[PDB]
């Protein structure tokens, strides 16, 4: 009977494959074959933030596109004011193995988690004026790879136990559990409307969930190795994934298929970070060869290089207004490019 | 004016945070974190001395942080990269399915990893008494066919002197690890193998000496002497 179920699943996968093949009629490159190229744009290191001791695993921009938060393996969480290159709120962490950090949309809270299998929520503004652990969430049996604030009262986390969880910060309990990933989830990205979110895991698959009840609407399988980073298109109808097979891919919703892959022959290092520009024309991908490649998302031709680091980048982000891009690195340096 | 006022307030807050941060840097520099890794749960990592476990111990007024992985899945492909900056990886192997082959494969994967290529390994061979009991009693020979051709090295220095067969087996296992260590990498990181009987307190001294040698080699590499 197990063999019968395996045959049933294989037949269903084949049927989905034929449905996708019938859906595809013309590649995205053919559509954007007459589009004027970007023009080989170059961006210099506008600023360098150098307050961390150990490698920087994650950083997240604020809503105002002025304040950012960075987490480093020296157990440090620093909120930089990028305009005046100043720093505020150097938050010490209970566990020094933080691997992710998030900034609340309202700007009132900061999340961080790591090898402790726990997500700590810190209240930025207090009557005492000192940042303290507002709440500790521990519903994960594996390391927290990513976390994102939903509405300043709910948080979505992905862990190394192959599960995602939507929490309630007030009650400190798991509200919803998203399951279906084989490999541990490495990254997640919220939709602009906060109605859906995509998650990329250690398997080649990426799954799209809806936070209201979380039943894994769609699954995309185009990569060949672990999906390290995921980012969501500004219009909300597409997303981009970066994997360890040294390729980036652009999937789209409501078509359940690949659109275009970004890769080069002389690239043999995996992707660690992926982000989109304000209009979505540019796709910024961080690499393991200490460089950041800026791709024309419509033509899959390299448009820029951002080689300002000494070690792997491991994190990058673009401001809400698209003014500047911040890249962290394992050399304990943050760089703001514009 | 508001703008100079808030700029001054932000600058003084930055100065205070800078003071606290240099104070924290002083503590962080003199710590020498280590990663205590074991092939399986059978290995007696605990007596060597959720999510992650911390152990603080001082040797000759030198602080040491040992991190033991707890509530994590068996797939260590991703989170092991968090330990590329540790001073050493204390790899504990029970020298008593073929668990030895699994330990060898794990050691090879750790040694040949791209991000751990600069991290040194302190190899501990536990279950020495168990290995002696198994060797004297009438599974090592069949698991490793090359053991028959193996001969005890000249610098065996068998201090316990329990048998000329136990020493041969333990040195065969040590050479099995050293083959990978020497072949895969040269001039970047070093492997320090030791025999432990799990009833001795000298393990922390051996770890201290190996860490001293590791940092000496790292400093020597700055001048390209090594």
């Amino acid at each position: 009977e197990l063999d019968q179920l395996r045959q049933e699943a294989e037949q269903l996968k084949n049927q989905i494959r034929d449905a996708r093949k019938a859906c595809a009629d013309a590649t995205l490159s053919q559509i954007t074959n007459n589009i004027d190229p970007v023009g080989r744009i170059q961006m210099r290191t506008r600023r360098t933030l150098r307050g961390h001791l150990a490698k920087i695993y994650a950083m997240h921009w604020g809503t105002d596109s002025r304040l950012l938060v960075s987490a480093s393996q020296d157990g440090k969480l620093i909120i930089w004011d990028s305009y005046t290159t100043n720093k505020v709120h150097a938050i010490p962490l209970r566990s020094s193995w933080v691997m992710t950090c998030a900034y609340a949309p309202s700007g009132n809270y900061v999340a961080c988690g790591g090898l402790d299998n726990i997500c700590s929520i810190y209240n930025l503004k207090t009557r005492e004026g000192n940042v303290r652990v507002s709440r500790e969430l521990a519903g994960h049996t594996g390391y927290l790879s990513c976390c994102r604030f939903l509405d300043d009262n709910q948080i979505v986390t992905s862990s190394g136990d192959t599960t995602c969880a939507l929490w309630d910060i007030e009650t400190g309990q798991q509200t919803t559990t998203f399951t279906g990933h084989t490999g541990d989830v490495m990254s997640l990205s919220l939709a602009p409307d906060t109605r859906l979110f995509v998650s990329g895991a250690c398997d080649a698959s990426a799954k799209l969930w809806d936070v209201r009840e979380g039943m894994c609407r769609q699954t995309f399988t185009g990569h060949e190795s672990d999906i390290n980073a995921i980012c969501f298109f500004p219009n909300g109808n597409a997303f981009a994934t970066g994997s360890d097979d040294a390729t980036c891919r652009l999937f789209d919703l409501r078509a359940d298929q690949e659109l275009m892959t970004y890769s080069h022959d002389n690239i043999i290092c995996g992707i660690t970070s992926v982000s989109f520009s304000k209009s979505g024309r540019l796709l910024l991908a961080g690499y393991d060869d200490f460089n950041c490649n800026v791709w024309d998302a419509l033509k899959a031709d390299r448009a820029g290089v951002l080689a300002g680091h000494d070690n792997r980048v491991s994190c990058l982000g673009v401001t809400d207004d698209g003014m500047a891009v911040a890249t962290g690195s394992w050399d304990s340096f943050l760089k703001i490019w514009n | 004016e508001d703008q100079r006022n808030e700029e001054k307030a932000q600058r003084e807050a930055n100065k205070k945070i800078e003071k606290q941060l240099q104070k924290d840097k002083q503590v962080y520099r003199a710590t020498h974190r280590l990663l205590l890794l074991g092939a399986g749960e059978s290995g007696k990592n605990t007596i060597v001395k959720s999510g992650i476990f911390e152990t603080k111990f001082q040797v000759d007024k030198v602080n040491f942080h040992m991190f033991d992985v707890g509530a994590q899945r068996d797939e260590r492909r991703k989170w092991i990269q968090c330990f590329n900056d540790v001073t050493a990886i204390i790899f504990v192997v029970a020298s008593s399915t073929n668990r030895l082959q699994a330990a060898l494969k794990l050691f090879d994967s750790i040694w040949n990893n791209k991000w751990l290529r600069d991290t040194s390994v302190i190899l501990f061979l536990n279950k020495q008494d168990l290995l002696a009991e198994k060797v004297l009693a009438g599974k090592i020979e069949d698991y490793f066919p090359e053991f028959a051709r193996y001969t005890t090295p000249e610098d065996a220095t068998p201090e316990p002197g329990e048998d000329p067969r136990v020493t041969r087996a333990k040195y065969f296992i040590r050479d099995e690890f050293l083959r990978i260590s020497t072949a895969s990498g040269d001039g970047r990181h070093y492997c320090y193998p030791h025999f432990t009987c799990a009833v001795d307190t000298e393990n922390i001294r051996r770890v201290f000496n190996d860490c001293r040698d590791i940092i000496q080699r790292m400093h020597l590499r700055q001048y390209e002497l090594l």
Partner: nanobody
Amino acid sequence: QVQLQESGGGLVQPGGSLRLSCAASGFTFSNYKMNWVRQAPGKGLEWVSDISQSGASISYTGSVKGRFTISRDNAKNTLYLQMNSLKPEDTAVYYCARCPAPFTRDCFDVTSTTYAYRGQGTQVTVSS
């Protein structure tokens, strides 16, 4: 998607010969190092052998060193394991595993349970 399908191997008399063929799809075969692992009844996954890209770095576990041989055809996108002298204690489910990262001399967690880039496996039983 990454799909590894193993074929061959049934009931074989002790001392007999067998051939296991692993067909791979969804990735560039030549970029990855391949592995053969096995799981005995009630024993857990154990590593049997591995071969690097384009061969030339073959290695086996000690138990099967003199008997089993592993080869690969990059053009045919296939992995082969020949078992020329079977013994009763190697009755197991055999899996074709593809290591997680391309262009890597190291590769992790093939023997770990719930591993993504592993096939369904074939039963190989040796008995009278």
